[PDB]
Design an enzyme around this catalytic site. Structure first.
Site, PDB file in Angstrom:
ATOM      1  N   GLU A   1      75.608   8.419  -4.540  1.00 15.04           N
ATOM      2  CA  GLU A   1      76.505   9.220  -5.395  1.00 15.04           C
ATOM      3  C   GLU A   1      76.757  10.539  -4.717  1.00 15.04           C
ATOM      4  OE1 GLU A   1      75.845  12.284  -6.907  1.00 15.04           O
ATOM      5  OE2 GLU A   1      77.446  12.322  -8.463  1.00 15.04           O
TER       6      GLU A   1
ATOM      7  N   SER B   1     113.562  17.832 -21.655  1.00 16.24           N
ATOM      8  CA  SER B   1     113.174  17.609 -23.065  1.00 16.24           C
ATOM      9  C   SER B   1     111.831  16.911 -23.149  1.00 16.24           C
ATOM     10  CB  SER B   1     114.180  16.719 -23.762  1.00 16.24           C
ATOM     11  OG  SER B   1     113.791  16.593 -25.117  1.00 16.24           O
TER      12      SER B   1
ATOM     13  N   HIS C   1      94.756   6.834 -14.747  1.00 19.93           N
ATOM     14  CA  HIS C   1      94.809   7.094 -16.195  1.00 19.93           C
ATOM     15  C   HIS C   1      95.893   8.150 -16.367  1.00 19.93           C
ATOM     16  CE1 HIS C   1      93.392   7.914 -20.253  1.00 19.93           C
ATOM     17  NE2 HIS C   1      92.407   7.035 -20.095  1.00 19.93           N
TER      18      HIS C   1
END
Ligand SMILES: *[C@@H]1O[C@H](CO)[C@@H](O[C@@H]2O[C@H](CO)[C@@H](O[C@@H]3O[C@H](CO)[C@@H](O)[C@H](O[C@H]4O[C@H](CO)[C@@H](O)[C@H](O)[C@@H]4O)[C@@H]3O)[C@H](O)[C@H]2NC(C)=O)[C@H](O)[C@H]1NC(C)=O
Ligand SMILES: *[C@@H]1O[C@H](CO)[C@@H](O[C@@H]2O[C@H](CO)[C@@H](O[C@@H]3O[C@H](CO)[C@@H](O)[C@H](O[C@H]4O[C@H](CO)[C@@H](O)[C@H](O)[C@@H]4O)[C@@H]3O)[C@H](O)[C@H]2NC(C)=O)[C@H](O)[C@H]1NC(C)=O
Ligand SMILES: CSCC[C@H](NC(=O)N[C@@H](CCCCNC(=O)c1ccc(I)cc1)C(=O)O)C(=O)O
Ligand SMILES: CSCC[C@H](NC(=O)N[C@@H](CCCCNC(=O)c1ccc(I)cc1)C(=O)O)C(=O)O
Ligand SMILES: *[C@@H]1O[C@H](CO)[C@@H](O[C@@H]2O[C@H](CO)[C@@H](O)[C@H](O)[C@H]2NC(C)=O)[C@H](O)[C@H]1NC(C)=O
Ligand SMILES: *[C@@H]1O[C@H](CO)[C@@H](O[C@@H]2O[C@H](CO)[C@@H](O)[C@H](O)[C@H]2NC(C)=O)[C@H](O)[C@H]1NC(C)=O
Ligand SMILES: *[C@@H]1O[C@H](CO)[C@@H](O[C@@H]2O[C@H](CO)[C@@H](O)[C@H](O)[C@H]2NC(C)=O)[C@H](O)[C@H]1NC(C)=O
Ligand SMILES: *[C@@H]1O[C@H](CO)[C@@H](O[C@@H]2O[C@H](CO)[C@@H](O)[C@H](O)[C@H]2NC(C)=O)[C@H](O)[C@H]1NC(C)=O
Ligand SMILES: *[C@@H]1O[C@H](CO)[C@@H](O[C@@H]2O[C@H](CO)[C@@H](O)[C@H](O)[C@H]2NC(C)=O)[C@H](O)[C@H]1NC(C)=O
Ligand SMILES: *[C@@H]1O[C@H](CO)[C@@H](O[C@@H]2O[C@H](CO)[C@@H](O)[C@H](O)[C@H]2NC(C)=O)[C@H](O)[C@H]1NC(C)=O
Ligand SMILES: *[C@@H]1O[C@H](CO)[C@@H](O)[C@H](O)[C@H]1NC(C)=O
Ligand SMILES: *[C@@H]1O[C@H](CO)[C@@H](O)[C@H](O)[C@H]1NC(C)=O
Ligand SMILES: *[C@@H]1O[C@H](CO)[C@@H](O)[C@H](O)[C@H]1NC(C)=O
Ligand SMILES: *[C@@H]1O[C@H](CO)[C@@H](O)[C@H](O)[C@H]1NC(C)=O
Ligand SMILES: *[C@@H]1O[C@H](CO)[C@@H](O)[C@H](O)[C@H]1NC(C)=O
Ligand SMILES: *[C@@H]1O[C@H](CO)[C@@H](O)[C@H](O)[C@H]1NC(C)=O
Ligand SMILES: [Ca+2]
Ligand SMILES: [Ca+2]
Ligand SMILES: [Cl-]
Ligand SMILES: [Cl-]
Ligand SMILES: [Zn+2]
Ligand SMILES: [Zn+2]
Ligand SMILES: [Zn+2]
Ligand SMILES: [Zn+2]
EC number: 3.4.17.21
Lengths: 694, 694
Positions: B370, B574, B633
């Site tokens: 990690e 917009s 995501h």
């Protein structure tokens, strides 16, 4: 009882005939009012037939049309600039339709505008190997020339791509009677052959699965951001126009330069088929000039989507889809398919009115704008990709039901092979001489498998129709089936009247299927497949059939590589990982099949049905294939040389193609090794989805 | 009974203490024999504890290490080339460990080699806004300079990226006592502060979610094709090295040029914090020279993967994972987390030995590497992405359980908010003064929500730990929880001894958690979450909580855009579609919740559990975010300025960031509009996964 026999018995040839007549009286070109009206009619009728919901799904996509007041044509021009011969402005309309309005004249959809003038080069079918022959062997340079190519053998967009990369400044496509006029049959209206004034319409895009050129990845809804036209996906850069063989003869007859290299370059016209460039001595100063004024326009399209909710697994979708838009009347393409879908909906609805529902949800679709690049199916799949990803069991396509009257033709995923074999063994053959015999028997006799005795041929899926997004992008098990001719060398060329004004109701009723028995057989195959997929307790997929083909495909790709043994030695190119993965898939699939046959527990069943459903999904790579992000299936993709054909292990196949011509062999063989790794990994990962889940 | 209380009561502080001692006696650096031995021990113990299967999953990934016989250091060099001051070659080891071998000296993992010599520029925290201040306001040019930056505020890889793009030829990172020395606490070993010889290790990669730099997209297995180092993902292009504040003082004390622009640029050392470039008058001819000789090496790593098979839904996975590799002893990071995971496995195994199994499968992971870029978790997720895609319910991370003793800290998807609130209301607070009160009560009092009264703060997920691939790439609902300090401005800087040799068992036992009560509380939170996710009949996710936050995030991104009203007018920008999508999600989520509360039918239940499970999945865009293909995501991504922080609507946020500085405002605002469309589409598509399925 409400079983498959009840469903199949409800289907009637006379209904298919009535629907076909109803759908082919006026043109239904995508984006036109006529086609919107037909969409509304289908929506109303599917409601009447008993579906639970029937909605229109609309999108605003790039379409292409000729300019009604500035028509497209090609000329031969003299040195003074006089146009001494002009190609036709329209096909002579068929008997009784000479007063129909809004027949779109022949054009190549999405051609850019221009008026290029130049010398002709003849390029046979404009295939990759035809350009290799011209440029590498014959030493003919197409740069700055207008190329003339005969239709046939490969998708016309591939021809145009090839001509563009060869440096052509324009492309003229024509129908040679060698490919579009069967010996001993009369021209329309007296037979099913193409007359000299007939012309094949069709788009020339190379979208590689993107859908609407302005909105790749996302549905072309009301708030969509669109690419500027200069960034659009897949548009050709040179003008293109199609012509009939009367006009082609006039363009080819004066051709000079080099003789055709061999007889495979000669068609059936009374010309030399000289490759050029340019015309023979006396006419050496004449040129060819194209005049193309078509415009690309964002235009609304409408899909009809009908739902028959499942009784037990409503969140599992079996989809039967085919398109509704046509170039002109659509006698075969697509309305022979749409009439079959209509009768299938009517039959399922009859069962529904008696209290039956299928186990899983069935969705029925009438797609729009298929002829302009699979636009309606692809935009809808983009909109609904998450639902389709997670819930899509299978997609069965339903374009043209007939392109001949000889035997069945089927292309599908290996997961459907056993389903198709079993269903066809239970259906009656409609063929002369096979009365009382199964369709499986007639089909197997007429179209034998090249691999196995007593089995029929089933081909791979590529592109060219509305299953593409479901199978190649999303990884949903897909299939298609129709009746076909006995003309093997013409399997990608289309029937003679393909995309012409002459494909009418009368063509089908007089010459193809007067009793609508071949249409009925196709309805039983397509409908029977949907019935089994939507009703079988265990999904009717056999993973062992994928194992068999994967070994076949691995042997084939290894054999291509082994044409280069010294490079495989030099660069340590091993297929060992891919054969290991295939061996593992075979073993795991065998064990899964044992559990499936051996497992009252609905969780184990559905767990197992989910393993079956997600198996096609496992062959998707979320990074896509090289420079083709919307082709994501690692085992199959449309051929980079012919969108109509499927290619196996496409990433490896393309890395190997013409590799001996690459300037950096280290880099090129490195990419072959990369593609072997991706394929080996993907096959092993798909195998592991069939292991015990914990 | 076998319920959550039984599970929670089995957890013991004294076991966590024994495990922490056992895991922290020797270094466990990724790729070393020591860490492989610990992997084998954990595998054996998880088997003993009762798990059904426990395997090692190994990969060969790019790691980075100093050269043991050619050490890294920095000098001040005079004009004659004499090195007159040298930074330390190692941290003074803590008491009783002065004879431990194989403590890796401080280094920045993945630094390239080099010996750049130059003038220093001081860049504060080297944040995007610090470089804006230097280059835009102060007009100081970092090109060809060595930058010196204090650690803190943002991920160190972002600092290095920023320095590289400013043209720096090297980066020196140091720990200022302002950020790493709390007032009134003693330095290690007499307290928990960083001594002047302590140094923070850590990687400086900018992988953007790719995992192993040589194999993006695919697991680094035995047959993997690897990129050449020149094509590797995420490697810095300039040398980097970290130092302690005794050494920093010596480098900063002679700095001249411009004064610091304001007090936010001054740390706590007795230097002026002059920005430079270079040294004051007398020392103007001295330079700084770096000597970096670290090497990148493909090295084997090992994850331990334990399975506890579900009784009812074995094909649904709840994952509890955290890493095992450490920079040195890992007293806090990661072994305070790993000890908690070990005790959670022991407790679940105790229930299993009594005949219990969870409803769904629980997977337990001890990840490797990690510290070198989330390599072990990411390679395993790449290998198993199809299983995780289709079966992954949730991922709970378990790195460091404590970084303070003040209150709880939680980051998670909105789908877990209600679960966390409910669980913490049922757990005992361990805090002084809250005896007999719930953890929810103490947490809410100490860390109030900025939005809502009587609610605690829960933050967004970005990156920096092993949940990244599961949440940002695959779209699996993820969460994390630990005990933290009361030091708000230091929330991304790390505790003082972070990644130093001084983070030992004694640090934790003496100064953080002598009774292991905070560890036990964290075990109850992480374990309780896994228990509920794996055992609740209906998945414990509340889609309405996503609706609430989506409105918050839409309001926030609109407010950023509205700083530019004239451009929004000019380019017709917009946000109407995005607010429409959020409104629709809110309405549909409300109706889904009604059905969920109102629906004996296991198919409807599982259908509904699948809708809950695939809801996080619906926010994934298969095309990824711009130039970050592994961040997929659409609602959350790690901040492009700070990998530790999550950003909402990241595609719109990045399109708007510093937009007033873009040279082509038409193009820049066009891309804002594109990102609004993608976000509006994605929110609506996620909403529609909650509609009735047919
Ligand atoms: C098909 O399925 C089989 C399982 O039946 C699967 O077998 C696996 O193969 C890999 C690759 O050969 C094996 O990996 C080895 O694992 C051991 C530890 O178990 C390692 O020590 C090995 O590494 C040493 O040897 C290598 C080769 O000489 C050296 O390169 C390396 O540096 C080491 O010295 C090696 O990683 C794995 O053990 C088996 N698993 C089994 C048998 O259970 C095979 O991979 C599958 N095919 C595909 C394409 O996935
Ligand atoms: C939130 O959910 C609502 C549903 O409750 C959903 O509403 C849909 O909005 C779209 C976009 O406004 C509507 O699209 C219209 O559809 C009609 C036919 O039904 C068309 O005729 C409309 O086009 C005309 O008007 C346009 C605007 O002036 C012109 O640009 C165009 O050229 C035409 O003249 C238009 O396409 C759709 O009908 C509703 N569906 C409903 C109410 O059921 C809304 O889209 C959802 N939000 C998001 C972000 O998805
Ligand atoms: C990419 S946008 C495509 C738009 C449009 N599509 C079609 O016209 N499709 C016709 C093509 C008929 C000739 C080639 N035949 C095959 O490919 C074939 C293969 C298997 C089986 I079972 C049946 C037929 C069709 O599929 O019927 C076009 O091509 O212009
Ligand atoms: C991209 S490769 C990363 C490799 C490695 N990872 C870590 O060291 N991670 C530590 C970082 C501690 C300091 C920042 N704190 C937060 O981000 C934070 C947020 C929420 C919650 I609840 C708890 C902590 C950690 O997550 O504990 C590195 O960063 O070098
Ligand atoms: C195709 O069939 C449809 C359905 O029968 C016909 O549309 C109907 O026409 C009648 C008479 O005009 C109307 O009363 C109905 O409202 C129509 N029903 C619909 C649209 O659902 C249509 O006329 C037929 N087309 C052709 C060319 O024969
Ligand atoms: C081919 O078509 C072109 C275009 O209509 C014809 O050329 C035109 O002829 C008219 C009348 O003689 C002239 O006024 C136009 O200026 C011409 N236009 C161009 C672009 O040349 C041409 O006569 C036709 N050729 C044949 C053989 O029918
Ligand atoms: C196609 O038909 C065959 C023959 O009936 C089916 O294979 C049989 O399946 C049953 C049920 O699992 C087994 O008990 C038999 O042993 C099978 N016979 C064989 C393999 O020769 C087959 O499953 C059908 N294919 C489908 C439904 O996709
Ligand atoms: C950490 O705990 C483990 C497990 O108790 C210890 O490993 C055991 O050591 C004994 C004595 O050497 C052996 O007989 C066992 O085979 C080991 N069991 C394993 C590896 O599962 C280990 O000694 C402890 N480490 C420290 C630093 O105390
Ligand atoms: C800083 O470290 C360097 C490198 O060890 C020292 O410079 C070396 O000194 C030795 C002995 O005097 C020489 O033989 C080497 O050639 C030198 N190497 C280099 C690269 O200069 C230096 O003395 C140290 N400086 C201090 C202040 O301790
Ligand atoms: C958190 O706890 C609340 C309070 O018990 C749960 O909300 C209740 O859920 C039940 C079962 O659906 C309903 O009958 C009640 O009306 C709910 N009360 C409310 C909303 O105030 C909630 O579901 C729990 N959250 C979880 C399990 O994720
Ligand atoms: C079509 O051609 C006419 C006649 O020249 C012209 O006025 C009009 O602009 C064209 N329509 C287009 C380009 O859409
Ligand atoms: C073809 O022609 C053009 C000259 O107009 C030239 O640039 C190009 O390189 C030529 N290609 C070959 C293969 O001769
Ligand atoms: C139908 O079959 C007959 C008999 O084999 C054949 O002569 C006829 O040409 C076929 N029609 C078509 C369109 O293929
Ligand atoms: C480390 O440095 C030594 C001593 O100079 C050298 O011999 C060796 O090549 C280096 N090791 C590496 C680069 O891995
Ligand atoms: C910084 O310095 C270099 C000259 O060495 C120059 O090329 C670069 O453009 C400079 N940038 C600014 C903003 O002055
Ligand atoms: C533990 O809490 C006490 C009391 O508030 C505090 O003085 C001490 O510094 C804390 N320890 C750490 C490491 O934060
Ligand atoms: Ca689109
Ligand atoms: Ca990888
Ligand atoms: Cl079809
Ligand atoms: Cl954590
Ligand atoms: Zn068609
Ligand atoms: Zn067609
Ligand atoms: Zn950590
Ligand atoms: Zn760490």
């Amino acid at each position: 009882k409400h079983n498959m026999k009840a469903f199949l018995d409800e289907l009637k040839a006379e209904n298919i005939k009535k629907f076909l007549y109803n759908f082919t009286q006026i043109p239904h070109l995508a984006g036109t009012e006529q086609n919107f009206q037909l969409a509304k009619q289908i929506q109303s009728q599917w409601k009447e037939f008993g579906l639970d919901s029937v909605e229109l799904a609309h999108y605003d996509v790039l379409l292409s049309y000729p300019n009604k007041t500035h028509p497209n044509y090609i000329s031969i021009i003299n040195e003074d600039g006089n146009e001494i011969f002009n190609t036709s402005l329209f096909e002579p309309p068929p008997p009784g339709y000479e007063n129909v309005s809004d027949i779109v004249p022949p054009f190549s959809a999405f051609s850019p505008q221009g008026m290029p003038e130049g010398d002709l080069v003849y390029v046979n079918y404009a295939r990759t190997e035809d350009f290799f022959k011209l440029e590498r062997d014959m030493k003919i340079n197409c740069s700055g020339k207008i190329v003339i190519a005969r239709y046939g053998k490969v998708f016309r967009g591939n021809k145009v791509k090839n001509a563009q990369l060869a440096g052509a400044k324009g492309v003229i496509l024509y129908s040679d009677p060698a490919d579009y006029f069967a010996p001993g049959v009369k021209s329309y209206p007296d037979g099913w052959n193409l007359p000299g004034g007939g012309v094949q319409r069709g788009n020339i895009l190379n979208l590689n699965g993107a859908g609407d050129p302005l909105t790749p990845g996302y549905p072309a809804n009301e708030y969509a951001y669109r690419r500027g036209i200069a960034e659009a996906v897949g548009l050709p850069s040179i003008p293109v126009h199609p012509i009939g063989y009367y006009d082609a003869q006039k363009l080819l007859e004066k051709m000079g330069g080099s003789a055709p290299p061999d007889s495979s370059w000669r068609g059936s016209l009374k010309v030399p088929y000289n490759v050029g460039p340019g015309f023979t001595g006396n006419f050496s100063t004449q040129k060819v000039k194209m005049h193309i004024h078509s415009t690309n326009e964002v235009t609304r399209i409408y899909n009809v989507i009908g739902t028959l909710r499942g009784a037990v697994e409503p969140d599992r979708y079996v989809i039967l889809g085919g398109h509704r838009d046509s170039w002109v009347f659509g006698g075969i393409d697509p309305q022979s398919g749409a009439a079959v879908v209509h009768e299938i909906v009517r039959s399922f609805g009859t069962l529904k009115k008696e209290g039956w529902r299928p186990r899983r949800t069935i969705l029925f679709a009438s797609w729009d704008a298929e002829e302009f690049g699979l636009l309606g199916s692809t935009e809808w799949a983009e909109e609904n990709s998450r639902l389709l990803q997670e819930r899509g069991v299978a997609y069965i396509n339903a374009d043209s039901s007939i392109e001949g009257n000889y035997t069945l033709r089927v292309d599908c995923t290996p997961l459907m092979y056993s389903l198709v074999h079993n269903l066809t063994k239970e259906l009656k053959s409609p063929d002369e001489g096979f009365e009382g015999k199964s369709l499986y028997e007639s089909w197997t006799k007429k179209s034998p498998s090249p691999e196995f005795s007593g089995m029929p041929r089933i081909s791979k899926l590529g592109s060219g129709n509305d299953f593409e997004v479901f199978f190649q992008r999303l990884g949903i098990a897909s299939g298609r089936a129709r009746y076909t001719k006995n003309w093997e060398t013409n399997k990608f060329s289309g029937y003679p009247l393909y995309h012409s004004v002459y494909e009418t109701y009368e063509l089908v009723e007089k010459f193809y299927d007067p009793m609508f028995k071949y249409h009925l057989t196709v309805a039983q195959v397509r409908g029977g497949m949907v019935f089994e997929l939507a009703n079988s307790i265990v999904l009717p997929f056999d993973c062992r059939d994928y194992a068999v083909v994967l070994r076949k495909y691995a042997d084939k790709i290894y054999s291509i590589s082994m044409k280069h043994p010294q490079e495989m030695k030099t660069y340590s190119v091993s297929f060992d990982s891919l054969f290991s993965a295939v061996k593992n898939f075979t073993e795991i699939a065998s064990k899964f099949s044992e559990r499936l046959q051996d497992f009252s527990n609905p969780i184990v069943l559905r767990m197992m049905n989910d393993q079956l459903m997600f198996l096609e999904r496992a062959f998707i790579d979320p990074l896509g294939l090289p420079d083709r992000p919307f082709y994501r299936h690692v085992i199959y993709a449309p051929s980079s040389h012919n969108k109509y054909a499927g290619e196996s292990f496409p990433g490896i196949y393309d890395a190997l193609f013409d590799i001996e011509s690459k300037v950096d062999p280290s880099k090129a063989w490195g990419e072959v090794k990369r593609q072997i790794y991706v394929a080996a990994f993907t096959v092993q990962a798909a195998a592991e989805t069939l292991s015990e889940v914990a």
